[PDB]
Amino acid sequence: IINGSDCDMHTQPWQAALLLRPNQLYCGAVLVHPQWLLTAAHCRKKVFRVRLGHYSLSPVYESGQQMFQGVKSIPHPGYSHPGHSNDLMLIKLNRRIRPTKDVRPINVSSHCPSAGTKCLVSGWGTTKSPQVHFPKVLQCLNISVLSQKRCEDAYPRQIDDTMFCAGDKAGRDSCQGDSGGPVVCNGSLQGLVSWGDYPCARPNRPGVYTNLCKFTKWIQETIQANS
Numbered sequence: 104i105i106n107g108s109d110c111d112m113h114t115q116p117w118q119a120a121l122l123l124r125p126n127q128l129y130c131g132a133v134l135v136h137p138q139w140l141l142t143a144a145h146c147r148k149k150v151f152r153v154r155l156g157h158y159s160l161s162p163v164y165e166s167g168q169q170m171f172q173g174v175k176s177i178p179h180p181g182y183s184h185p186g187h188s189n190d191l192m193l194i195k196l197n198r199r200i201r202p203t204k205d206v207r208p209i210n211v212s213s214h215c216p217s218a219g220t221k222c223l224v225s226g227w228g229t230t231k232s233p234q235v236h237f238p239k240v241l242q243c244l245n246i247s248v249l250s251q252k253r254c255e256d257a258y259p260r261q262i263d264d265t266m267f268c269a270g271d272k273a274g275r276d277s278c279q280g281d282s283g284g285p286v287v288c289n290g291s292l293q294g295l296v297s298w299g300d301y302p303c304a305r306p307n308r309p310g311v312y313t314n315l316c317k318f319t320k321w322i323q324e325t326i327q328a329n330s
């Protein structure tokens with residue numbers, strides 16, 4: 104997250120980290136059900152461990168942390184790697200979470216956030232771009248939803264309704280390492296960190312996010328079919 108701030112501790116209880124062996128941050132993810140995560144479908148590598156209720160990037164012990172294994176990883180059937188469309192995937196945890204102040208699911212609303220809506224994006228991705236610099240703790244940044252017309256103008260012939268643009272201010276954006284992390288608007292999960300431009304936070308190059316309001320039926324039906 105470029106030019107965000109340290110999240111307040113215990114404020115993003117739906118934030119997850121997908122780790123590679125032994126505890127290498129791979130992608131962000133979001134707890135959407137007591138036994139399921141959403142992440143970007145481009146976060147394809149086999150996950151070693153899911154880490155929840157944890158603030159720091161390092162493996163330092165935190166009383167609120169909960170570790171899991173992914174047992175199912177279901178990308179949206181419309182995703183076709185390396186294309187950006189339908190950039191979402193459901194991950195089933197090996198067991199249901201233990202509900203705490205640090206570990207709590209967030210719901211996806213079918214209401215699509217409108218242009219100008221203020222949303223919060225979070226992640227442990229680089230805080231600088233092009234220079235790679237990881238933070239010590241979870242970073243939070245407010246970004247505003249752009250109209251689909253302004254999104255199309257920024258990325259001509261690269262945008263469809265499965266995506267939304269957000270983040271109108273130069274110097275502020277999500278970036279590499281933030282992939283699959285949450286975009287929360289008015290208390291509900293409406294986006295996943297998907298893609299954008301390089302270096303991150305360029306003027307007139309907003310971040311591109313998976314438009315989750317378009318997938319509530321798929322999310323609900325897939326969780327139900329795999330229960």
Ligand SMILES: N=C(N)c1ccc(NCc2ncc(-c3ccccc3)[nH]2)cc1OCc1cccnc1
Binds near residue numbers: 232296
């Ligand atoms: N500027 C942003 N808001 C932004 C946010 C997240 C990401 N995530 C990385 C990422 N998304 C998708 C892929 C991918 C897809 C298919 C095949 C292999 C890889 N990789 C990238 C972002 O901007 C582009 C970017 C690229 C490289 C270095 N820095 C920024």
Ligand SMILES: *[C@@H]1O[C@H](CO)[C@@H](O[C@@H]2O[C@H](CO)[C@@H](O)[C@H](O)[C@H]2NC(C)=O)[C@H](O)[C@H]1NC(C)=O
Binds near residue numbers: 108243
């Ligand atoms: C993102 O925006 C929200 C909403 O404007 C900010 O939260 C507000 O913060 C102040 C207190 O510091 C108060 O106006 C409210 O109590 C907060 N509102 C809500 C909805 O929580 C938040 O600080 C911003 N975060 C960042 C990282 O900029």
Ligand SMILES: *[C@@H]1O[C@H](CO)[C@@H](O)[C@H](O)[C@H]1NC(C)=O
Binds near residue numbers: 106273274275
């Ligand atoms: C970082 O963001 C804040 C607003 O959140 C802004 O006031 C500040 O100028 C930005 N910093 C840079 C270096 O762009």
Ligand code: NA
Binds near residue numbers: 106107108109
């Ligand atoms: Na900062």
